[PDB]
Amino acid sequence: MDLNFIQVILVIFVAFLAGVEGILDQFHFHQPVIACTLIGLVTGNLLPCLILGGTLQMIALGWANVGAAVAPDAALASIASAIILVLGGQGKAGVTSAIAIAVPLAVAGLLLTIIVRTLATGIVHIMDAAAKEGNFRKIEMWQYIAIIMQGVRIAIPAGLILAIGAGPVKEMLTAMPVWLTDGLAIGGGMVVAVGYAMVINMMATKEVWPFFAIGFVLATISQLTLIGLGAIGISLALIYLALSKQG
Template sequence: MLIQNTLIALVAYISQLDERYLGASMMNRPIIIGPIVGLILGDLQKGTLIGAALEAMFIGIVTIGAALPPDVGVASTIATALAIQSGASTNVAVTLAMPFAVVAQGLNMLAFTLNSYTIKKGRDAIKKHHLASMQRWQFFPLILRLPSGILTFLVLQLGTTAAQSLISLLPTKLMTSFSVAAGLLPAVGFAMLIQMMINKKIAPYFFIGFILTSYLKMPVIGVSVLALLFALLIVQNSTQNKIKE
């Protein structure tokens, strides 16, 4: 268990480097983290299911500019691992994720605050032409991301037994409320995503897709293929109009 928790903590740490140090590798997304944690714990299927459920909930949470959203990477790592180790359901994992996301967000805020000092020191080193010093300050932020990995390790090392005991003591009504909350949270995630991207030009296509799936019972794959055809027609018409002009 110690080795597994260490590997999972390493996954949480690597998720902190995504978009900042490793490019947009998507390593911090639940759909990627869930299967990896499941593979480490020997339950790839459950890890994949939990990762997909968490991705649906967090799909609208993305880093834009200087905004610092809740940390979905650490939250997904901890929630998936706790659910698998304690034998809890996917619904419990979804409910547990948000509190850990907020805690990890606080650690990220601390890291960014301290990082402003390292940036200043790095700039001073550049002005003085101290290349070696500049390189050291360049990699110092990697150390500032360690608390997220440490948090993950401590929660898993100390909290698995407690989580198992707590889940076994929870009444049926409370577990039912977890299931209801887990069903609502993905809808909130999609609503956040739609709120960012919806406009007058896109709205008609959104409602066409809604009508096709809800009333005409068209499978998602069929709607996706139809959407691709719509996109191709729009691009072709746009190209032809430019040629005529």
């Protein structure tokens, strides 16, 4: 409600910074703690946004981009959840609804960044055309344009959420069915199977499937920790290698 022109501009700038670091991924301005705390600081809602950032960072610890496989976009989740929490009032008590909506926002941001990474191919082709002429200035300009477009990818949804004011945000925050939240939690708990499937498909051969089966069965012993299972796996790999080198 109280967001004036300066606070709106600062929110847009923080969203752009998070979007830029979503692809650069060096300064980590897109991490939930940094982005949510910055949104809180610029909006004045420092403490609830800091708590939301900590919770979402705990949720988003394992979101890593490996090769061409992109993680679920912590940048959009962080920025949109912080903005919605600020707009919805109920600062410290509104963290639960923001956390509930963050993960679908993360998947939507993953879709958006897939689209933008697809469109980056035309920019790279233009840069190839520039390189055929030895033009450093054009290559630098188009690299800057690509970074700007990737930042705008996140800067636009923030501006749209700001345009759709606090009224509708609160009316959708209160009118959220409980069954939807529980189903979203169940789905999020089931999502990790996709990453497990991708990794297994990467390293699956008929010679290592028995080790997968042994690990799966041994994980049913609740008294065994993950470090113990990892040590068992390392020892089994060492024994297998030792018995294989002499053959």
